[PDB]
Amino acid sequence: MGKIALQLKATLENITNLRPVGEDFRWYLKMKCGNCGEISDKWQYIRLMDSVALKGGRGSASMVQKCKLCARENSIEILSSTIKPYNAEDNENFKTIVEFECRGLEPVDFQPQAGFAAEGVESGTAFSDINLQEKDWTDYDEKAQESVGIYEVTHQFVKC
Ligand SMILES: [Cl-]
Ligand SMILES: [Zn+2]
Fold first, then answer.
1. Nearest bound ligand to the CA of residue 36
2. Which of 63, 71, 99, 150 is the most buried (most CB within 10 A)?
3. Key word Zinc present in the record?
4. How far is the CA of 127 from the centre of ligand 1 (A)?
């Protein structure tokens, strides 16, 4: 078992409280088998709503997968109490937004897609259904009379 933090960085414009929303939120990841090193060929996602009870007091997992190359049964779990928003004050800094407990599947890449939400920095205008798949996003806050944006989204992994 190991924990891994996923840190986001983005440039924010007139936006705050940027966060994944809901138990159905999808963390799209490329995952590495911890025994044979095989990295998934396609993006896979994991979500809190898929939680499954592991046998024999081992706890739970968000995803269990038998490695196709070495037959190990590996798992990974999103830690829900570690999910944090990315705020106006975090602008352009890496910041941990979620942690995963890894039992033989470890993420080595991350693709933010849909399901994020955020709000106008002063207006509190709600923006939902934000898709970051392009790594840029723009909209207009009518209450603020300002453009809002999230640009140059990137990430990195910290082993905890
Ligand atoms: Cl998947
Ligand atoms: Zn393997």
1. 2
2. 150
3. yes
4. 27
